[PDB]
Design an enzyme around this catalytic site. Structure first.
Site, PDB file in Angstrom:
ATOM      1  N   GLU A 238     -94.781 -57.547  -7.316  1.00  0.00           N
ATOM      2  CA  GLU A 238     -95.298 -59.080  -7.138  1.00  0.00           C
ATOM      3  C   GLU A 238     -96.643 -59.259  -7.588  1.00  0.00           C
ATOM      4  OE1 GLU A 238     -96.846 -60.321  -3.653  1.00  0.00           O
ATOM      5  OE2 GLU A 238     -95.392 -62.251  -3.367  1.00  0.00           O
TER       6      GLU A 238
ATOM      7  N   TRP B 196     -89.667 -64.528  -3.444  1.00  0.00           N
ATOM      8  CA  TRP B 196     -89.717 -65.781  -3.675  1.00  0.00           C
ATOM      9  C   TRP B 196     -88.464 -66.651  -4.061  1.00  0.00           C
ATOM     10  CZ3 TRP B 196     -94.666 -67.841  -3.501  1.00  0.00           C
ATOM     11  CH2 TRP B 196     -95.858 -66.903  -3.272  1.00  0.00           C
TER      12      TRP B 196
ATOM     13  N   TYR C 168     -99.711 -68.419  -7.349  1.00  0.00           N
ATOM     14  CA  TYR C 168    -100.752 -67.504  -7.679  1.00  0.00           C
ATOM     15  C   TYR C 168    -100.997 -67.027  -9.230  1.00  0.00           C
ATOM     16  CZ  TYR C 168    -101.015 -67.209  -2.601  1.00  0.00           C
ATOM     17  OH  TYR C 168    -101.225 -67.360  -1.093  1.00  0.00           O
TER      18      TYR C 168
ATOM     19  N   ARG D 248    -123.870 -63.173  -7.180  1.00  0.00           N
ATOM     20  CA  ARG D 248    -123.164 -63.470  -6.002  1.00  0.00           C
ATOM     21  C   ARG D 248    -122.198 -64.545  -5.860  1.00  0.00           C
ATOM     22  NH1 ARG D 248    -129.326 -62.949  -3.637  1.00  0.00           N
ATOM     23  NH2 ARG D 248    -129.840 -64.556  -5.382  1.00  0.00           N
TER      24      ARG D 248
ATOM     25  N   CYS E 232    -101.774 -69.503   0.948  1.00  0.00           N
ATOM     26  CA  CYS E 232    -102.336 -68.879   2.373  1.00  0.00           C
ATOM     27  C   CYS E 232    -103.485 -68.127   2.166  1.00  0.00           C
ATOM     28  CB  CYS E 232    -101.071 -67.888   2.646  1.00  0.00           C
ATOM     29  SG  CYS E 232    -100.064 -68.656   3.975  1.00  0.00           S
TER      30      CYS E 232
ATOM     31  N   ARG F  47    -106.305 -68.214   5.202  1.00  0.00           N
ATOM     32  CA  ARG F  47    -106.346 -69.262   6.119  1.00  0.00           C
ATOM     33  C   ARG F  47    -105.228 -69.267   7.363  1.00  0.00           C
ATOM     34  NH1 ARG F  47    -102.130 -73.103   5.924  1.00  0.00           N
ATOM     35  NH2 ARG F  47    -100.711 -72.257   4.274  1.00  0.00           N
ATOM     36  N   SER F  48    -104.353 -68.368   7.112  1.00  0.00           N
ATOM     37  CA  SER F  48    -103.021 -68.305   8.031  1.00  0.00           C
ATOM     38  C   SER F  48    -102.419 -67.081   7.881  1.00  0.00           C
ATOM     39  CB  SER F  48    -102.181 -69.497   7.750  1.00  0.00           C
ATOM     40  OG  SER F  48    -101.246 -69.298   8.747  1.00  0.00           O
TER      41      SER F  48
ATOM     42  N   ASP G 276     -99.437 -64.388   9.635  1.00  0.00           N
ATOM     43  CA  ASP G 276     -98.454 -63.531  10.476  1.00  0.00           C
ATOM     44  C   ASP G 276     -98.666 -62.147  10.766  1.00  0.00           C
ATOM     45  OD1 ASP G 276     -95.962 -62.320  11.390  1.00  0.00           O
ATOM     46  OD2 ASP G 276     -94.989 -64.065  10.586  1.00  0.00           O
TER      47      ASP G 276
HETATM   48  O1  LIG Z   1     -98.478 -63.653   2.423  1.00  0.00           O
HETATM   49  C1  LIG Z   1     -98.386 -64.394   3.339  1.00  0.00           C
HETATM   50  C2  LIG Z   1     -97.498 -65.595   3.385  1.00  0.00           C
HETATM   51  C3  LIG Z   1     -97.611 -66.415   4.456  1.00  0.00           C
HETATM   52  N1  LIG Z   1     -98.132 -65.944   5.904  1.00  0.00           N
HETATM   53  C4  LIG Z   1     -97.427 -66.939   6.862  1.00  0.00           C
HETATM   54  C5  LIG Z   1     -98.551 -67.524   7.574  1.00  0.00           C
HETATM   55  C6  LIG Z   1     -97.686 -68.494   8.378  1.00  0.00           C
HETATM   56  O2  LIG Z   1     -97.087 -67.622   9.348  1.00  0.00           O
HETATM   57  C7  LIG Z   1     -96.625 -69.166   7.381  1.00  0.00           C
HETATM   58  C8  LIG Z   1     -97.472 -70.318   6.734  1.00  0.00           C
HETATM   59  O3  LIG Z   1     -97.611 -71.468   7.535  1.00  0.00           O
HETATM   60  P1  LIG Z   1     -98.481 -72.530   7.348  1.00  0.00           P
HETATM   61  O4  LIG Z   1     -99.616 -71.367   7.753  1.00  0.00           O
HETATM   62  O5  LIG Z   1     -98.816 -72.908   6.123  1.00  0.00           O
HETATM   63  O6  LIG Z   1     -98.669 -73.677   8.307  1.00  0.00           O
HETATM   64  O7  LIG Z   1     -96.734 -68.080   6.624  1.00  0.00           O
HETATM   65  C9  LIG Z   1     -98.744 -64.648   5.887  1.00  0.00           C
HETATM   66  O8  LIG Z   1     -99.527 -64.274   6.887  1.00  0.00           O
HETATM   67  N2  LIG Z   1     -98.709 -64.111   4.847  1.00  0.00           N
HETATM   68  O1  LIG Z   2    -128.079 -73.435   2.165  1.00  0.00           O
HETATM   69  C1  LIG Z   2    -128.419 -72.551   1.304  1.00  0.00           C
HETATM   70  C2  LIG Z   2    -128.759 -72.570   0.133  1.00  0.00           C
HETATM   71  C3  LIG Z   2    -128.895 -71.396  -0.654  1.00  0.00           C
HETATM   72  N1  LIG Z   2    -129.139 -70.358  -0.034  1.00  0.00           N
HETATM   73  C4  LIG Z   2    -129.342 -69.026  -0.995  1.00  0.00           C
HETATM   74  C5  LIG Z   2    -128.470 -68.004  -1.339  1.00  0.00           C
HETATM   75  C6  LIG Z   2    -129.019 -67.241  -2.393  1.00  0.00           C
HETATM   76  O2  LIG Z   2    -130.544 -66.399  -1.749  1.00  0.00           O
HETATM   77  C7  LIG Z   2    -129.905 -68.340  -3.343  1.00  0.00           C
HETATM   78  C8  LIG Z   2    -128.434 -68.612  -4.174  1.00  0.00           C
HETATM   79  O3  LIG Z   2    -128.605 -67.569  -5.642  1.00  0.00           O
HETATM   80  P1  LIG Z   2    -126.859 -67.229  -5.970  1.00  0.00           P
HETATM   81  O4  LIG Z   2    -126.380 -66.813  -4.459  1.00  0.00           O
HETATM   82  O5  LIG Z   2    -126.264 -68.364  -6.392  1.00  0.00           O
HETATM   83  O6  LIG Z   2    -126.760 -65.965  -7.092  1.00  0.00           O
HETATM   84  O7  LIG Z   2    -129.712 -69.417  -2.232  1.00  0.00           O
HETATM   85  C9  LIG Z   2    -128.855 -70.069   1.250  1.00  0.00           C
HETATM   86  O8  LIG Z   2    -128.638 -68.758   1.903  1.00  0.00           O
HETATM   87  N2  LIG Z   2    -128.488 -71.340   1.961  1.00  0.00           N
END
Ligand SMILES: O=c1ccn([C@H]2C[C@H](O)[C@@H](COP(=O)(O)O)O2)c(=O)[nH]1
Ligand SMILES: O=c1ccn([C@H]2C[C@H](O)[C@@H](COP(=O)(O)O)O2)c(=O)[nH]1
Lengths: 316, 316
Positions: free
Chosen positions: B60, B82, B146, B178, B198, B218-219, B221
């Site tokens: 994958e 998939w 992806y 950065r 995810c 973000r999410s 399992d």
């Molecule tokens: O690689 C993966 C793919 C999916 N999920 C899980 C997160 C949730 O259990 C579900 C997605 O539901 P939503 O989070 O989109 O609502 O799939 C993982 O933890 N890992």
């Molecule tokens: O709200 C803000 C805006 C900027 N930076 C800082 C991060 C870095 O010090 C610099 C950005 O440089 P680069 O990270 O993009 O390379 O500004 C913060 O910490 N907070």
């Protein structure tokens, strides 16, 4: 105390941050990956061990919320946080005919008199943007900044998407959604930008009638950056909660490259010798609920009693 | 032991995860915001307290790396992770004329015979994609997955951006950058998708000649999802390090909504009674360095000695 996580981050970077050179050739001490949380039910996380200008925070946030991208709004509130960005364009325009301002940012840092002619041109520029509508439309508009990214994401199909407006609706209709996400990162734009979004992405989360928000900050200036960043997003968390009629949970702050510039060590060390005081309390207009139609008067900070401010040179 | 952070996450969600209902009406125990790190110099973080199919992970991942979006590749490797996604389209097509497959996912979960006719149609579908090139081009291509997000981000200007290819170059020319960031989240597409990414975003970081990678999921399992997610990204970290001639640092895994579905508690509890064994060692082809031209044979896992696998019902 509520702000202790911040102080703990400062310590950690001092203790185990590895020296890492950066683009400004200044020098930093950094750590990769860190996370701290603040229980918003305990108070507002605006630092007390050092004075932070909340006014600059509320104005700039509202500016974002309005989907605004024109500095004019900010100058109207004496907020100069973004001037440097607009001023640059002006300087490099064909209409600009005055003293060569090359590398003005740090050039002023190394010349009391250059900073004089520079602060002169800047003061003029800000005046034009404030009064000359046509000039403002041309130089006062940053274009690609948080406001447009949050509220007007340009699509290939030619439209614009209001990420924030849509997510707030989802929170109202599907609070248990695991994808209440707002992104500020656009691979298409990121390459040609001067400073790509530091606050890359944030996510909402709801449970037990409480709203929490996690922020992913790719880069961070522990000393000058973070104190502000914490306030901006803890405030956004409150506003959105208010608008959705939910209680407030916690602000989780995730970091990519957290850093301390070498020229802030004596200042950071000093702050570390201070003892946090109780945190201030935030108060929003109970009658008004549409957060996009909010203004300064609608948000007030109470019982904020900080230590004196700490001056330090910005890394430019 | 190396995998202890995972076990620690499982425990934490059991101890303080608040019940939170989810879209599948199954039920979960969740926590918002968590982060764990793995020192890749200590071994490969593929769980030993339970058997995980690394083959499904390497295939994958390569599929992603090739910028591929057609399932055909996967089936060629017996990887069916998939299928469900492509099969759905087929079923809802005007060309599909067979047994009504409505809600087949869990409908099969509640019918030994439905699962029979269902596993029949599926077995056929996979055959067509494998042999009928025209059918594959129509139903075997997932489109927005992806591979295209990483390697062919569609721009408004009509082009396609190779995020991953570009970032690897930046790591080679500006390792201390950065903003070595790759995003899989597109506000334009997210609304019409069945399952928005995810694995929302990841970021590289280089210091002391070592490469680290932070992932924002973000999410998650905890039971069925995470064991895999850890392996996919720790492997990507190795491959990119290999390609750039750097040493390996650590994989930092950040979470949004980490969750345990109610029907995995007895299984998770059992696993928790097992004692981690030493972690396996990963070995990549030393001669070949262009990771985009990699194939199964180029990556081998050594000394992986897990406990027996643990069966559990998927939440559909
Ligand atoms: O690689 C993966 C793919 C999916 N999920 C899980 C997160 C949730 O259990 C579900 C997605 O539901 P939503 O989070 O989109 O609502 O799939 C993982 O933890 N890992
Ligand atoms: O709200 C803000 C805006 C900027 N930076 C800082 C991060 C870095 O010090 C610099 C950005 O440089 P680069 O990270 O993009 O390379 O500004 C913060 O910490 N907070």
């Amino acid at each position: 105390m509520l702000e202790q996580p911040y102080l703990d981050l400062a310590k950690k970077v001092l203790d185990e941050g590895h020296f890492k050179p950066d683009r400004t050739h200044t020098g930093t001490y950094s750590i990769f990956g860190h996370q701290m949380r603040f229980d918003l039910s305990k108070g507002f996380p605006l630092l007390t061990t050092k004075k932070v200008p909340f006014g600059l925070i509320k104005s700039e946030l509202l500016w974002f919320l309005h989907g605004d991208t024109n500095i004019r709004f900010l100058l109207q509130h004496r907020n100069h946080i973004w001037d440097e960005w607009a001023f640059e364009k002006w300087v490099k325009s064909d209409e600009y005919h005055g003293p060569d301002m090359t590398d003005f940012g740090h050039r002023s840092q190394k010349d009391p008199e250059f900073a004089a002619v520079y602060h002169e041109e800047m003061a003029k520029f800000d005046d034009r943007v404030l009064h000359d509508d046509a000039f403002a439309a041309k130089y006062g508009d940053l274009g690609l900044v948080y406001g447009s990214q949050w509220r007007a994401w340009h699509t290939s199909k030619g439209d614009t998407i209001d990420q924030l407006g849509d997510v707030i609706e989802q929170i109202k209709t599907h609070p248990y959604s695991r994808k209440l996400i707002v992104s500020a990162w656009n691979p298409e734009d990121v390459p040609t930008m001067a400073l790509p979004p530091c606050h890359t992405l944030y996510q909402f989360y709801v449970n037990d009638g409480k709203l929490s928000l996690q922020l992913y900050q790719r880069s961070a200036d522990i000393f000058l950056g973070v104190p502000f960043n914490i306030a901006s997003y803890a405030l956004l968390t409150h506003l959105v909660a208010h608008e959705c009629g939910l209680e407030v949970g916690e602000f989780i702050h995730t970091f990519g490259d957290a850093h301390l510039y070498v020229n802030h060590l004596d200042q950071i060390k000093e702050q570390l010798s201070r003892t946090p005081r109780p945190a201030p309390t935030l108060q929003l207009n109970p009658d008004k609920h549409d957060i996009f139609d909010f203004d300064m008067k609608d948000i007030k900070l109470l019982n904020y009693d900080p230590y004196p401010a700490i001056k330090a040179p910005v890394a430019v």
